[PDB]
Design a protein around this ligand. Sequence first.
Ligand SMILES: *SC[C@H](NC(=O)CC[C@H](N)C(=O)O)C(=O)NCC(=O)O
Length: 106
Amino acid sequence: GSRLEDAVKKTVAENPVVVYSKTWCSYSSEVKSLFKRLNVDPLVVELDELGAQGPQIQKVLERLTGQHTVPNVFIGGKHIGGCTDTVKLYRKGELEPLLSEANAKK
Ligand SMILES: *SC[C@H](NC(=O)CC[C@H](N)C(=O)O)C(=O)NCC(=O)O
């Protein structure tokens, strides 16, 4: 449990943009599209493709972020929120500078 938390923390530190996702979730597909449009290639972890580990990672995500929904977006090692939250940062003009500070590749 503490190792899983540690692994999540490393994941978000190793990658400019991380999206914890589920393949079927429209909001997740939507935030992935936004990143595609902004020429970012995030690390996408599909919780529904992880079997038993999926619910385990989500437990950790809820502890670290306060959020129980997907997508769970991180940029530059920092929790952003979900699709709607990410889109808010975009509309406000704050998203691209964050992606730059995170050195988002592509
Ligand atoms: S599609 C799966 C569900 N996601 C959302 O409802 C995300 C909405 C947010 N406002 C956003 O990301 O934009 C989901 O995670 N359902 C699980 C549940 O417990 O409701």
